[PDB]
Design an enzyme around this catalytic site. Structure first.
Site: not given
Ligand SMILES: CC1(N)CCN(c2cnc(-c3cccc(Cl)c3Cl)c(N)n2)CC1
Length: 477
Positions: A411-412, A414, A416
């Site tokens: 993810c963004s 990496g 959360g």
């Protein structure tokens, strides 16, 4: 980590700093989080926001944990000089507040081991406290020992000797200097009693108890333990690597990081090997990291990727397109990727890719890209169904490939969303093979993952979501 107060109001926070503190003194608290600092005989409050991706200080920088935010600003105007310590035991593993004598003995017998201890509100003596320890079934080789803690004039003691400011002072003192019994029994406070470890089958009952908030209390008790996982991230700071990071302060630990052997400092990637089936928890690609991402996938022999975010969210880049268009062929440095075919499901898109080294033919392998795309912009999904079905498909595609490397999850930042999926998968993998009759401890598994990558599982929303995901899977098993 004594600077975080979890049960105070802005008014209480203002008194504390202006009376029991000095200029430079600070403290953090939830209101999202608030950083209360003292400047020229006055309290200045600051907003700390967590979307579920990272910790964001307005005007400041983006961090993986609340501890590193405080650490970074205790060396880098608002000055963070003297942390104002909290004397409240709510966020402590050993504290069990309103608890009875037999209720405590029940737990220490069922789950306890040598040096298993807990503190509770005194049943008999009003306003006092009780320290229950198990030194060592039905053989009488082990025993429960009740040590009274007298509360007098906002101070704590065990009937004599030193008078402590907080139960935390007393506990940490008798952990280092153990109480010796009159006949020589050493009352070792080895470790606090485990209570979060529950049977997989009793999840509906545990969630019912946590919903009464129980999830919040249990979540911040785990955040208290983050200062114990502040391992070195030296490589991420190295000059030539600073640009290879989405966020200059969210760096991978040196001991678990993925070292690129392909070949100045061509060995860096903001990624980590998560070993509980293995995983690679990485961020969303940058223009200057796409070639490195494929060099990792190749090296670690990864055949399945889990994209937990969209390419663009709320008008900004969350992960750059690193894969070629459907039916197209592209070269990313020395790697060659072919997008064979795209198949859309409701909650995701699957991309059949064929990765290989340039020049070598038999180096080809199929890389199945699982792109989840029904995760909300802010928060966690309403129902865990879609996620679980996705992970079920991902597992079976991983199981079908012989000698497959770790599942790449990103993810963004990496940490959360990446952490949520990985934790949900680890727990769901246990219930899948080792049936409904096995012990499941959610905050222990998170802490184990957090030891391998900083800030894995960011919000209480995701924490609760992990419990709701685990419950559902069992309920439908
Ligand atoms: C009322 C109370 N004081 C708050 C909730 N509570 C607990 C206890 N233990 C954990 C735990 C379990 C395994 C690993 C780690 Cl690192 C942690 Cl922190 C936890 N998250 N919450 C019980 C006591």
């Amino acid at each position: 980590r004594r600077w975080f107060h979890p049960n105070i109001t802005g008014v209480e926070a203002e008194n504390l700093l202006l009376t029991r503190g000095v200029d430079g003194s600070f403290l953090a608290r939830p209101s999202d989080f608030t950083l209360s600092v003292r400047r020229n005989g006055a309290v200045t409050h600051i907003k700390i926001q967590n979307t579920g991706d990272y910790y964001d200080l307005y005007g400041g920088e983006k961090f993986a944990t609340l501890a590193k935010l405080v650490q970074y600003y205790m060396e880098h105007v608002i000055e963070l000089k003297y942390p104002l310590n909290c004397a409240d035991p709510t966020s402590e593993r050993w504290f069990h507040g309103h608890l009875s004598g037999k209720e405590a003995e029940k737990l220490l017998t069922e789950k306890g081991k040598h040096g298993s201890f807990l503190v509770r509100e005194s049943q008999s003596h009003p306003g006092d406290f009780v320290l229950s320890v198990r030194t060592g079934s039905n053989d009488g080789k082990s025993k429960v020992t009740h040590v009274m803690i007298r509360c007098q004039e906002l101070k704590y003691d065990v009937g004599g000797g030193e008078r402590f400011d907080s139960l935390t002072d007393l506990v940490e003192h008798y952990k280092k200097n153990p109480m010796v019994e009159t006949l020589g029994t050493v009352l070792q406070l080895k470790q606090p009693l485990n209570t979060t470890r529950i049977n997989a089958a009793e999840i509906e009952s545990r969630v019912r108890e946590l919903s009464k908030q129980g999830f919040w209390e249990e979540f911040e008790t785990l955040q208290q333990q983050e200062c114990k996982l502040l391992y070195s991230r030296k490589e991420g700071q190295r000059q030539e690597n600073k640009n290879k990071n989405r966020y200059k302060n969210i760096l991978p630990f040196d001991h678990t990081r993925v070292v690129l052997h392909d070949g100045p400092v061509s060995d860096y990637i903001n990624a980590n090997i998560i070993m509980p089936k293995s995983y690679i928890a990485t961020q969303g690609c940058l223009q200057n990291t796409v070639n490195d991402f494929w060099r990792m996938v190749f090296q670690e022999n990864s055949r399945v990727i889990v994209m937990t975010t969209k390419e663009v969210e709320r008008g900004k880049s969350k992960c750059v397109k690193y894969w070629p268009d459907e039916y197209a062929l592209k070269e990313y440095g020395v790697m060659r990727v072919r997008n064979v075919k795209e198949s859309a499901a409701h909650d995701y898109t699957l991309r059949e890719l064929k990765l290989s080294k340039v020049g070598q033919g038999n180096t080809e392998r199929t890389v199945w890209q699982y792109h989840f795309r029904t995760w909300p912009d802010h928060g966690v999904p309403s129902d865990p169904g879609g996620v679980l079905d996705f992970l079920e498909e991902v597992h079976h595609k991983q199981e079908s490939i012989m000698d497959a490397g770790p599942v790449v999850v990103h993810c963004s930042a990496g940490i959360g969303r990446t952490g949520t999926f990985i934790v949900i998968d680890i727990l769901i993998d246990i219930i899948r093979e080792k049936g409904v009759d096995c012990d499941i401890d959610v905050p222990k598994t998170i802490q184990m993952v957090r030891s391998q990558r900083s800030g894995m599982v960011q919000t209480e929303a995701q924490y609760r979501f992990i419990y709701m995901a685990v419950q559902h899977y069992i309920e439908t098993l």
